[PDB]
Amino acid sequence: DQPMEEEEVETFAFQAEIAQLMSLIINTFYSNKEIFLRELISNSSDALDKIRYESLTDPSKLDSGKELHINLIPNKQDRTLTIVDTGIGMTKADLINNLGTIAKSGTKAFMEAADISMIGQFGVGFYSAYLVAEKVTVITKHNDDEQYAWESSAGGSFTVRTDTGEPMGRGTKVILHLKEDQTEYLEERRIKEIVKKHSQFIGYPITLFVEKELE
């Protein structure tokens, strides 16, 4: 038989510091792990600013969707928390450069420094995900390009491939498969309080969708 699907998959090694960093974040104990959701919402907001500011000069840039927002989708059945935004998105190359193989100065500094919530300033805030996730999947779609999937369980490497899933119009989808002991962030009350405490100044709509598959 012919496969329902077949696509090339590429594996990349993380730059050495970023990898050392992820182990740091994974194995060590930290107390305000909740700041991961702020870091990821924060990434979404900047992505939303870029598409927004580009549309000002080139209105067709929004042909792939006018609405600028962030959705938070807890799914207790999958034990996943997904952050979805309709920002500018990422090309395949962006995924490879910006999410693993290029380091940046803050990396060596940060590992050595202190409270974990500093990670936002050192520029590598994405990786705070692995405070609560054992695996992170990033689905992204940039205008005029394919939809891509970035994936990592933080073993020193990550994978990129074309995404066969459900088509996004534009933007980025981050899928946190949470550690067994971090399921609290699937909770509406907990999500609401983290957002109110750390993401109060985000100038885009933030909407929760509690997901439950029915029998």
Ligand SMILES: CCNC(=O)[C@H]1c2ccccc2CN1C(=O)c1cc(Cl)c(O)cc1O
């Ligand atoms: C990876 C580095 N890019 C960004 O943070 C933002 C960003 C920031 C400034 C300009 C363009 C873009 C595109 N991004 C994304 O597609 C994205 C990435 C992650 Cl990891 C996330 O959680 C949410 C996201 O919307």
